[PDB]
Design a protein around this ligand. Structure first.
Ligand SMILES: [Ca+2]
Ligand SMILES: [Ca+2]
Ligand SMILES: [Ca+2]
Ligand SMILES: [Ca+2]
Ligand SMILES: [Mg+2]
Ligand SMILES: [Mg+2]
Ligand SMILES: [Zn+2]
Length: 147
């Protein structure tokens, strides 16, 4: 849902993040999250606070940065949020929007993104990611292509 947030919503979330981030180091700790929760009448344990962070902790460093905070504010988990971002990346290559990346689409978009590969490199990239062997890369294959 983080992709559906408006500009004013994001600007308000920036103000909120700054109030959570007491020491201004750009990350929210369990200590900082706990302060906020208790100001709102809750008493989460340290384990419950760490779990709130883990649910959005895409990089696994144990703290919330602002992109992860946007996941939290959209009331989403990190797995759904990452799937939204992978699907956005997929759509960049799927120029004709049919749900499959062709060799010509991969060559075209990679070229315009500054990496001009030979026709042989593109065919090789397609074949390696093409699991079901239909000659194209669907979304589920695109995810494994990126791991
Ligand atoms: Ca901090
Ligand atoms: Ca993190
Ligand atoms: Ca396509
Ligand atoms: Ca395929
Ligand atoms: Mg969304
Ligand atoms: Mg966006
Ligand atoms: Zn995200």
């Amino acid at each position: 849902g983080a992709d559906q947030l408006t500009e004013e919503q994001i600007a308000e979330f920036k103000e909120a993040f700054s109030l959570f981030d007491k020491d201004g180091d750009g990350t929210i700790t369990t200590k900082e999250l706990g302060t906020v929760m208790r100001s709102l009448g809750q008493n989460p344990t340290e384990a419950e606070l760490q779990d709130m962070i883990n649910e959005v902790d895409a990089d696994g460093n144990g703290t919330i940065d602002f992109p992860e905070f946007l996941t939290m504010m959209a009331r989403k988990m990190k797995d759904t949020d990452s799937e939204e971002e992978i699907r956005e990346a997929f759509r960049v290559f799927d120029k004709d929007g049919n749900g499959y990346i062709s060799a010509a689409e991969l060559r075209h978009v990679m070229t315009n993104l500054g990496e001009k590969l030979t026709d042989e490199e593109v065919d090789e990239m397609i074949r390696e990611a093409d699991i079901d062997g239909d000659g194209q890369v669907n979304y589920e294959e695109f995810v494994q292509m990126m791991t």
